[PDB]
Amino acid sequence: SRGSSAGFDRHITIFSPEGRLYQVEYAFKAINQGGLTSVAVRGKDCAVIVTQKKVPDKLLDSSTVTHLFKITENIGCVMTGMTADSRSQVQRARYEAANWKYKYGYEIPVDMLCKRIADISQVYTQNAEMRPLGCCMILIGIDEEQGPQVYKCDPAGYYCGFKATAAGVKQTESTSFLEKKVKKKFDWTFEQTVETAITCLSTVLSIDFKPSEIEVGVVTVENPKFRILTEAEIDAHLVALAER
Amino acid sequence: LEGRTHIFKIHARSMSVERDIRFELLARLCPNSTGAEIRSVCTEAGMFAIRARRKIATEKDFLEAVNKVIKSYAKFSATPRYMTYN
Amino acid sequence: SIMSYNGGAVMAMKGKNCVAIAADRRFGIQAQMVTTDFQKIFPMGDRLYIGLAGLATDVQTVAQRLKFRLNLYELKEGRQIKPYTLMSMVANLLYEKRFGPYYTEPVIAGLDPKTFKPFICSLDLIGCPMVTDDFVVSGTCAEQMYGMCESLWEPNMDPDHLFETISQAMLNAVDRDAVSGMGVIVHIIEKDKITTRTLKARMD
Amino acid sequence: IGTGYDLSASTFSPDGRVFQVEYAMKAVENSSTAIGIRCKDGVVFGVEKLVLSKLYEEGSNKRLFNVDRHVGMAVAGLLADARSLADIAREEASNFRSNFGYNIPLKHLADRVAMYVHAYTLYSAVRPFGCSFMLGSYSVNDGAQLYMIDPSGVSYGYWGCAIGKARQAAKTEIEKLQMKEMTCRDIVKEVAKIIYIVHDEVKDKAFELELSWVGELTNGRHEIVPKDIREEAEKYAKESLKE
Amino acid sequence: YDRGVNTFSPEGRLFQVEYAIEAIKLGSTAIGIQTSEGVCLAVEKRITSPLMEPSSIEKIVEIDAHIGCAMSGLIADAKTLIDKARVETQNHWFTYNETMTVESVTQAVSNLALQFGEEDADPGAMSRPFGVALLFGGVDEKGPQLFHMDPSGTFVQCDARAIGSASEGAQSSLQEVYHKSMTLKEAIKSSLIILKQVMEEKLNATNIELATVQPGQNFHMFTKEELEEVIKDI
Amino acid sequence: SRRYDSRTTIFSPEGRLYQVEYAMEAIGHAGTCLGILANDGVLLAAERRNIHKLLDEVFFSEKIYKLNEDMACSVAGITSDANVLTNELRLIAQRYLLQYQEPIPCEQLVTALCDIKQAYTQFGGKRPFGVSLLYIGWDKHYGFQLYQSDPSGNYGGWKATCIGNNSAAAVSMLKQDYKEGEMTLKSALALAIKVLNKTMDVSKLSAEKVEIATLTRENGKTVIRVLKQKEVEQLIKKHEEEEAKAEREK
Amino acid sequence: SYDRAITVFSPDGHLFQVEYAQEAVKKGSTAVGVRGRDIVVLGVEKKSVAKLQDERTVRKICALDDNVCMAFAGLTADARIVINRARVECQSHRLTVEDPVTVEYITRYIASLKQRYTQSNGRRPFGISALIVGFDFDGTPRLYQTDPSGTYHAWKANAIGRGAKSVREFLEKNYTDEAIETDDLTIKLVIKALLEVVQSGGKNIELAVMRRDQSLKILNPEEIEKYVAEIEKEKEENEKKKQ
Amino acid sequence: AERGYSFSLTTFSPSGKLVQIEYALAAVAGGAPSVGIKAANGVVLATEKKQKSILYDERSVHKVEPITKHIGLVYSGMGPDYRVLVHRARKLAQQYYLVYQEPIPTAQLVQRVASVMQEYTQSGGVRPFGVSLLICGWNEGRPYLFQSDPSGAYFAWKATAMGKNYVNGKTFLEKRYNEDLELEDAIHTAILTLKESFEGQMTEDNIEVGICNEAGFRRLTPTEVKDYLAA
Amino acid sequence: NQYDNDVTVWSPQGRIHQIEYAMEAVKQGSATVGLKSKTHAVLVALKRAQSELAAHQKKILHVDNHIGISIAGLTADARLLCNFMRQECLDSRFVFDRPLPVSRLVSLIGSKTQIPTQRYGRRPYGVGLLIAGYDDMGPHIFQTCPSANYFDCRAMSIGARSQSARTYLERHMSEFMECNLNELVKHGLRALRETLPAEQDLTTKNVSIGIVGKDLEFTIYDDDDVSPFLEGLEERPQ
């Protein structure tokens, strides 16, 4: 064992002799190929998403490069990994939400959306004909009673709720940072959250962003409609960090 | 077709065979067997021809050999698996 | 009517720790009788009988598919069926043909195989269940049977009085129905035994 | 890495790559160059259509397609695949019209077709498309738009873009234009110019230039550049090539 | 190494089709001769034992009254094609009230050629080609015709052809002796002669089967006596 | 797809089906199960592999499935596949009952299941059912019967036989001890306890290790009963008290 | 469903699965049949005398109709399937046509079925061979044989299974018009042929006979013992009183 | 475009083993441990719900799931597969209830679930589930504790353990546990046998517990688990 | 060798080998040449025979009154596509009562032949076509490959030893647009000639001619109907 292989256990989604699924692990490796990093932090009265906006060339409509997607008017998501797979998964999520509202007559909760998407990817994990998606979705939204919510789903079928999370290249480091800064117990206001997320990404990459190098999604209890901050308001948050 | 006949004639050309029997018939019953197997026949009859007590072999002696070697030793052959270079 | 094509009558009645189910015995096609020993009451376990009136084809076919499902049930699980459960199972079976229904209105009578507590019920042709603490009826002489059972039935009856009651009710109800009768058969079931009797009835 | 990990699109490599998609992309790379560039009043397409024989007619193997009356398409790569994708795009646009009543928005057509392309990079039962394509459109309610789609299913919006052999070189030539302020009229010459620059007369033989309008000058209809403007731009190019 | 049944070789060919052609080489040899007086078909039966009733060997069958068929290779695979041919002729008569032309029947049977393949097909569609060669011999408005078919699905008209294990020899022998003015007698005689040349076991009345189709006479399978009368004139 | 197909329904060059053979090997490593026919009944007796101190015992048995009012079966091999096959057996028997309103003859039930297993060997590309069965039953045509089926869908009738681990030993012992036409339920029970005692790896033999079922005919009804542990201990004690008796003679 | 070609051609032009099927047949219990005048006799060799085994449940001679019986060699389960299908078809022939069933017809059906399984996706050839035996209306007695390939022929006498070559040689040398001149003589010929491959017994020979419009008759081992006894007697009254 | 692989991925080895099933079982015996005890008047399931950090919200996903009002589930092995099986088990339970208007017996739900698991060892193009399930139930007065493994086979237990170190847990149960135990004592010994492996300060959010008495199945609140973890 | 057997497998160098190998099946077929004037479209095909006692394979097929085809490759696939094209033409006449434009028919063939180059266990059509037609946009000669690509040609040749013909045609393109029918058929016959050794030459037995034009429905000339074209040709000793 400890790295043993037999038959096709490294080509298709079947069990290795030590009970691994190697193709799924490879999908996780495929997430990092995008070379991006995304941070998601849950506040007392809000939820914030922030992600690098790598526009390598001025020949690109920088407005069409976005990893933030509106799944519902009140549910936002950020995708990390293979781009086209991410869009596929976004379409599926949209469909599942719309369908949920149509059948059940209330707005879908992020919890159940994430669970549904996860459930779908597990099938890819269990059927041999197709390969998992090399993407990772983080959902944010305000639920009616549980407050603000941040969830996350994997290429294998795993999903979970978080106080704070990150995905991509600098995942482990961002989790270290955030798990350091969550224990300190501070009044998680909106600006506290936004600043926390931005600084997490910034320190993790050692960059100090321009307002055109990142993108910030948000959702608040006072305003549950998923809002994508303009470059202006982003900068407004940036200059406020070089004060303390 | 014309090849094996040369292979048969070449191989058997050097032994006491029945001059009536025409290797052509045998060659016909040999679609795709290498020139080696064709050799197990020419010598195969040897056993048969010796198994009774005879100097010269007959048509059937070859026929049997053909059916004795080729066919019987068909499962093995490996000439059809090695054709596609496996 | 379709239900009057073969005619027939089935009744079930509660007692103390006992229960009773009776039926006429005629198999007739409209006015004409073909046989006088037709089975309308089918055992679905020890101490659980189902009573089927209506169109004789669907009597037989519903009985048969019910025995199908029931056998499977009693094999998968290691127990005889509970009466409630049988009722729901019949209901399901009937509603499966909601748009081309079996023309039978079943009556169930039986004792809870764990307890001994009597159960009786009846269902629609599409399987609407209906449980009572007194009696249930089905068939071409439903009005008659209702009239007799409302006037004869007392609550806590012992097996002999249950017998006398259901017998008189069936007889007098059936003898005022043209297409029911040719004999009456009565199964009174208790914890310890099952009594089956055939009454002396008119044959006209 | 080629150890069975590169025979199907249903198979990840142990570093987390799908090599069939990469090889499809490589099929695109080996193709002649086509560029497209968006200005303030529409989108212009240019294709370096290599002539493989003098026996082929002028205008054979067009690599500019009318996907909808407001959307043009420019392809590069395995041409069969490109045609099939043109048919798919057409039908997506058609269905959109019939079901929702208006001409399909380019961003949405791009999303749809690109999801269709991405659908072929998941299973072993089919192969990824060996073509990359550009979609251009102009509307008064949306503006001028230009998207590109690669074999992986990725769809991006561009101001200027190129596909095929001389992708980079073409991009470098394009970044020297100020197209966010130029008109379509003007851009055609610069497209023809960039094509003539990028073309390698040594490796590739003779060639034919394809050019496409779509903009306020055409009332939103994607059209071919008239022989007049085309020859004008070609002349400008040849003369600009001597420097 | 496993490949599909629908794979091309670099030399540009389907390995299943080629292999099937190889499978024909093993079959009993057959000769067909086209002639302005009719078409003749012979085949050697290849009885493996005196115990085997040779009348239960039919490598020559009637597709219809004016079209006969001689088969070589895997006979079991031939039966399916022959049935489909019969049904096809009859459908054409049903529909148009006139017999099928030999070329039309031939074409029809040839359409079941490359109808094999794995996924993307019916659950009762063919897994491999037919390992059989056919000779259709008929008479129609164009007169006496003879066609030959192989598992490639290519069918071609032939004046005189041989199929089977002794294909090459018999074909050469046929070329040496054929002219477009032979009589049916000379054709049958020639056929029996070449057949005797190539046959392993001695030619006799219960060892080959022989059939003619002439413009004025429906498909005729030669009886034992009728065969004897011809073999007599060796 | 051509690559990952293990090709299960295919001949081996010697003329055999590998997955069927291998399945038989799987069967060889299962709990011993044997069946003896008699003139006044028929019985199944099986080794219990579910023998651990924490097992709760919630079913009437472990290896004896009741399929029909007249008929019952025991199994050997992969237990889940046995659940599949037993479900299907039930269905078959109840279908026959629905069609003919009389119990299915045992041979038809066995054939009906065997055709399913065979089907699995011939097409579909699935693995075959790694299960052998013994069937005991009674019918109005051939009376008491014992049958046996293998994963090839091939079946046969016996007067006594065994299946599972150390099957061949048990078969030989039965060839010695059987008594054609002269068999009774009592004698057969003795034989069962004997062969079970010799074939089971763990000697001494507790009732916690064996499972006995009899099928007998009582007053027009068919009775199938699994022996309570007490009766089984009586049988075992009887075996030892007979064995210590024939050892005195020397 | 499973749509994969199991039986395909080998580069030398053989169907290998069919050959392995035929091997499976070659591992079968020996079965022979001879055809008489008013009797047709089929006998099958090793009954696998386990003595604890109910012979009735392992018979390898079944009846297809009142007119036709059949023996086999190969994979018993496959045989069971083929036999049942043939039975169904024997009856459906009587439905669709008031006339009964001829041995050639049912032979043709079975043959076609096997061939079908040699040329359908997913399926695997039935590994059996059959001796089909019967009396057609008009009274002519007939014996045909089939094969895992789908080929079929009529025989006067034949053998299949383990050591079929030996029995076949014997039958070649011993089938005369003198032998099988009486029922008692044809049965004798079959027992003589079967004793030349069997394990030397008599309890290991089953013999079944069909005769005229009468039904199938399977022989009890008493009668079989009697016939093998007259055999051993004639093998010591014409072979002992000479050599 | 897409179909489905039609051939089995789980096939007999020459030794007669279904190798994929044993490797799936290897995946089970690598998951967090879970212990189940049937105790006269009730059933206890407990499992190690240990996260990776402080960022995961443990009040969001659960491992002890209800199937109906009287049957509960825990698992060892792969998470997603468990999710699938739980959905499917709830569906089966509700089919049974539609038809019999009586809550499904625990044995029958175990049978049905097991059948589902067996399908994915014989249907085409798939792997078996990498999950062992412990299913607790109250029906007919008595309590019920079953286990189903990836082969689709199921067993009734008085008590058992699965996941990592399931052997030592099992022995500990064989010794330090017996009948006539009240549910409370059973919860006690369950948390006890879970502690024989929990590498950590077993908190009230590090483990999840469910009970099943003749008042219905329910998950113990974190508060109740804290109270029980206070000895 | 692992990228050779399936059409769904891209090679690490950006190519699909089953498609290529399929393309090689076109070169195995006897040569055929197709050229157009401004009014006529002409196919000339070298027919080929198995043995001397067998007829020559037919190589020009009639599709519709305005469209004929010349085939090169697997004949079964040829007939498959031919039936499809005839069906499409009949569908067009049925629904629209106008002949189907050649370019659209060709597009349909592209669509049809592209499909099996993308699905597993399917194989590309092993046949190349030259399509001669006349519609409202004049004469047309099209070429179709097993790769499902197609080309609008001014003249073309495909098959074995067709490069010679391609060269010749490439030399006399400038003449064709003004040629008369007899001269056009001649040029096609010469192109077809340059595809033979000096030992063998054209005959009324191994040549087939097909013409369609503004005043002429598609017509095939096979035997003695070919002789007036051949008997009008100056031989060539080089």
d(CA H24, CA F204): 36
Judged on CB neighbours under 10 Å (0-12, 13-18, 19+), A1 is: exposed
Question: Do H5 and H149 contact (CB within 8 A), yes or no?
Answer: no
Record the tokens describing residue D137, joined without a space: 């459109």
Residue reference for tokens 């058929």 = I185
In Å, how far is H93's CA from the nearest CA of chain C?
Answer: 15
Contact across the interface for F98 and C76, Cβ inside 8 Å: no
Cα distances (angstroms) measured from residue C41 to each of A30, G50, H225: 69, 50, 56
In Å, how far is D241's CA from the nearest CA of chain I?
Answer: 30
Query: Which of the residues G10, G16, G26 would you substitute to probe the B interface, choosing the one with the greatest number of B C-beta atoms within 10 Å?
Result: G10
CATH number of the CATH domain containing I180: 3.60.20.10
In Å, how far is G122's CA from the nearest CA of chain H?
Answer: 10
d(CA F245, CA F226): 29
H101: left (phi over 0), alpha (psi -120 to 50) or beta: left
Q: How was this structure determined?
A: cryo-EM
Query: F155-157 and F143-149 as β-strands: parallel, antiparallel, unpaired?
Result: antiparallel
- Picking from H125, H170, H120, H174, the residue whose alpha carbon sits closest to that of residue H149 is H120
Query: Which residues are bridge partners to G72 per DSSP?
Result: G130
> Phi then psi for G232, rounded to 5 degrees?
-60, -30
CA angle F212, F217, F221 (to 5 degrees): 115
| Chain I nearest-CA residue for F1 | I120
E/B Cβ contact: 3+ pairs below 8 Å: yes
Q: May I ask the CATH architecture of the domain F1-248?
A: 4-Layer Sandwich (3.60)
CB atoms within 10 A of CB C31: 8
Indicate the helix (H) or strand (E) that contains D114: helix D106-118
DSSP string, D136-192: EEEETTTEEEEEEE-TT--EEEBSEEEESTTHHHHHHHHTTS-TTT--HHHHHHHHH
Cα distances (angstroms) measured from residue H144 to each of A197, E137, H138: 49, 79, 6
Contact across the interface for H125 and A129, Cβ inside 8 Å: yes
Judged on CB neighbours under 10 Å (0-12, 13-18, 19+), G209 is: buried
Query: G217-218 and G206-210 as β-strands: parallel, antiparallel, unpaired?
Result: antiparallel
Record the tokens describing residue E13, joined without a space: 């060919």
AA identity, residue E100 = M
- What is the Cα F167 distance to its own chain's centre? 11
B/G Cβ contact: 3+ pairs below 8 Å: yes
CA angle C158, C160, C161 (to 5 degrees): 70
Contact across the interface for I9 and D127, Cβ inside 8 Å: yes
Q: Sheet containing F71-77: which strands, arranged edge to edge?
A: F64-68, F71-77, F131-139, F143-149, F155-157
Record the tokens describing residue E30, joined without a space: 């057959």
Indicate the helix (H) or strand (E) that contains E68: strand E67-73
C132: left (phi over 0), alpha (psi -120 to 50) or beta: beta
d(CA F143, CA F136): 11
Record the tokens describing residue H127, joined without a space: 């792997």
Query: Helix, strand or coil for residue H75?
Result: strand
Q: Which domains does chain E have, with CATH numbers?
A: 2-234 (3.60.20.10)
Question: Do D10 and D123 contact (CB within 8 A), yes or no?
Answer: yes
CB atoms within 10 A of CB B74: 15
d(CA A177, CA A161): 18
Q: Which residues of H touch C69 (CB under 8 A)?
A: none
Q: Which residues of E touch B28 (CB under 8 A)?
A: 165-166, 169, 198
The neighbours of chain E, by the rule of 3 or more Cβ pairs under 8 Å, are B, F, G, I
d(CA I158, CA I45): 10
Indicate the helix (H) or strand (E) that contains D94: helix D79-100
Is F2 an interface residue toward D (CB < 8 Å)?
A: no
Question: Do F240 and F76 contact (CB within 8 A), yes or no?
Answer: no
CB atoms within 10 A of CB F181: 6
F/A Cβ contact: 3+ pairs below 8 Å: yes
Cα distances (angstroms) measured from residue D96 to each of D156, E176, H58, I111: 21, 71, 45, 22
Tell me the three-class secondary structure of D23-63, residue by residue.
Answer: HHHHHHHCCCCEEEEECCCEEEEEEEEECCCCCECCCCCCC
> Phi then psi for E35, rounded to 5 degrees?
-155, 145
Record the tokens describing residue F59, joined without a space: 């079913």
d(CA G152, CA G104): 9
**Which residues precede chain breaks (C–N over 2.5 Å) in chain H?**
none
Residue reference for tokens 């022998």 = E173
CB atoms within 10 A of CB H166: 20
In Å, how far is I51's CA from the nearest CA of chain D?
Answer: 35
d(CA I192, CA G78): 59
If one looks up domain D1-240 in CATH, what number appears?
3.60.20.10
| C-alpha dihedral sign at D17, D21, D23, D25 | negative
Q: Which residues of F touch A8 (CB under 8 A)?
A: 3-4
d(CA D119, CA D96): 20
Record the tokens describing residue I143, joined without a space: 């070429």
Could you give the count of Cα atoms lying within 13 Å of H72 in the half-sphere of its Cβ? 31
First to last CA, chain E: 53
In Å, how far is D35's CA from the nearest CA of chain A?
Answer: 12
Q: Which residues of I touch D120 (CB under 8 A)?
A: 118
Q: Which residues of E touch G13 (CB under 8 A)?
A: 19-26, 131
Structural domain count, chain I: 1
Tell me the residue ranges of DSSP E strands in chain A. 37-42, 46-52, 68-72, 75-81, 135-142, 148-153, 159-162, 164-168, 214-220, 227-228
Is E176 an interface residue toward F (CB < 8 Å)?
A: no
In Å, how far is G125's CA from the nearest CA of chain H?
Answer: 18
Contact across the interface for G21 and F15, Cβ inside 8 Å: yes
Question: Do E74 and E131 contact (CB within 8 A), yes or no?
Answer: yes
Determine the angle formed by the axes of helices F185-199 and F229-243, rounding to 10 degrees. Answer: 80
Is F152 an interface residue toward G (CB < 8 Å)?
A: yes
Record the tokens describing residue A106, joined without a space: 């209330």
- Picking from H227, H230, H220, the residue whose alpha carbon sits closest to that of residue H46 is H220
d(CA D100, CA F202): 77
d(CA A16, CA A10): 8
Match domain C1-204 to its CATH number in 3.40.50.2000, 3.40.50.1000, 3.30.470.20, 3.60.20.10.
3.60.20.10
CA angle A145, A150, A154 (to 5 degrees): 130
Query: Which residues are bridge partners to D157 per DSSP?
Result: D147
> Phi then psi for I117, rounded to 5 degrees?
-90, 15
In Å, how far is F66's CA from the nearest CA of chain G?
Answer: 23
Query: Which of the residues G2, G4, G123 would you substitute to probe the H interface, choosing the one with the greatest number of H C-beta atoms within 10 Å?
Result: G2
In Å, how far is A89's CA from the nearest CA of chain D?
Answer: 10
Q: Number of helices and strands (H, E) in chain C?
A: 4, 12
First to last CA, chain B: 26
The DSSP code for G197 is T
What contacts E106, CB < 8 A, 6 or more positions away? E136, E147, E149, E155
**For chain B, which residues lie within 8 Å of any Cβ of chain E, measuring from their own Cβ?**
1, 24-25, 28-29, 31-32, 63, 84, 86
* Chain H contacts in chain C segment 74-113 (CB below 8 A): 76-77, 82, 84-85, 88-89, 92
AA identity, residue I141 = I
Query: Which residues are bridge partners to D43 per DSSP?
Result: D38
d(CA E24, CA E77): 11
Is F4 an interface residue toward A (CB < 8 Å)?
A: yes
- Picking from F160, F151, F89, F155, the residue whose alpha carbon sits closest to that of residue F119 is F151
Record the tokens describing residue F83, joined without a space: 């659940």
CB atoms within 10 A of CB E201: 10
d(CA A178, CA H124): 45
Q: Which residues of F touch A129 (CB under 8 A)?
A: 1
- Picking from A166, G148, C103, A23, the residue whose alpha carbon sits closest to that of residue F11 is G148
Judged on CB neighbours under 10 Å (0-12, 13-18, 19+), I115 is: middle
d(CA I77, CA I89): 18
**For chain D, which residues lie within 8 Å of any Cβ of chain F, measuring from their own Cβ?**
7, 124-125
CB atoms within 10 A of CB F175: 12
Is G10 an interface residue toward B (CB < 8 Å)?
A: yes
I/C Cβ contact: 3+ pairs below 8 Å: no
Q: May I ask the CATH architecture of the domain A1-244?
A: 4-Layer Sandwich (3.60)
Question: Do H31 and H187 contact (CB within 8 A), yes or no?
Answer: no
Query: Which of the residues G3, G145, G177 would you substitute to probe the E interface, choosing the one with the greatest number of E C-beta atoms within 10 Å?
Result: G3
d(CA F28, CA F166): 7
Is E2 an interface residue toward F (CB < 8 Å)?
A: yes
d(CA I75, CA I216): 27
In Å, how far is F217's CA from the nearest CA of chain C?
Answer: 19
d(CA H208, CA F193): 48
- Picking from H202, H217, H172, the residue whose alpha carbon sits closest to that of residue H47 is H202
Q: Which residues of D touch H3 (CB under 8 A)?
A: 125
Contact across the interface for H3 and D125, Cβ inside 8 Å: yes
d(CA A90, CA H119): 31
Question: Do G12 and E22 contact (CB within 8 A), yes or no?
Answer: yes
d(CA G155, CA G144): 6
Cα distances (angstroms) measured from residue I15 to each of B55, D122, D167, G16, I7: 64, 19, 20, 34, 10
Judged on CB neighbours under 10 Å (0-12, 13-18, 19+), F180 is: exposed
Q: Which long-range contacts (CB under 8 A, 24 or more apart) does D201-204 make?
A: D204/D32, D204/D50
Cα distances (angstroms) measured from residue I116 to each of G228, I7, I8, I23, I79: 67, 8, 9, 14, 17
Residue reference for tokens 């909760």 = A109
Contact across the interface for A58 and D159, Cβ inside 8 Å: yes
- Picking from A106, A101, A112, the residue whose alpha carbon sits closest to that of residue A151 is A112
Contact across the interface for G13 and E24, Cβ inside 8 Å: yes
Quoted resolution (Å): 3.5
Query: A37-42 and A164-168 as β-strands: parallel, antiparallel, unpaired?
Result: antiparallel
Q: Which residues of G touch H124 (CB under 8 A)?
A: 2
d(CA D197, CA D209): 12
Q: Which residues of G touch E112 (CB under 8 A)?
A: none
What contacts A69, CB < 8 A, 6 or more positions away? A76, A77, A78, A79, A90
Q: Which domains does chain H have, with CATH numbers?
A: 3-231 (3.60.20.10)
Judged on CB neighbours under 10 Å (0-12, 13-18, 19+), A103 is: exposed
Query: Alpha helix (H) ranges present in E59-183?
Result: 75-96, 102-110, 167-177
Residue reference for tokens 């792969």 = H78
- Picking from E201, E223, E221, E199, the residue whose alpha carbon sits closest to that of residue E212 is E221
d(CA I9, CA I24): 18
| C-alpha dihedral sign at A230, A233, A235, A237 | negative
d(CA E129, CA E109): 13
CA dihedral E116, E118, E121, E122 (to 10 degrees): 90
> Phi then psi for A219, rounded to 5 degrees?
-150, 135
Query: Alpha helix (H) ranges present in A80-189?
Result: 83-104, 110-126, 171-182
- Picking from E51, E52, E71, E50, the residue whose alpha carbon sits closest to that of residue E60 is E71
AA identity, residue G25 = V
* Chain A contacts in chain D segment 140-199 (CB below 8 A): 146-147, 152-161, 171, 174-175
Record the tokens describing residue F195, joined without a space: 């062969």
d(CA A157, CA A151): 13
Q: Per-domain residue ranges for chain C?
A: 1-204
- Picking from I154, I111, I106, I114, the residue whose alpha carbon sits closest to that of residue I131 is I106
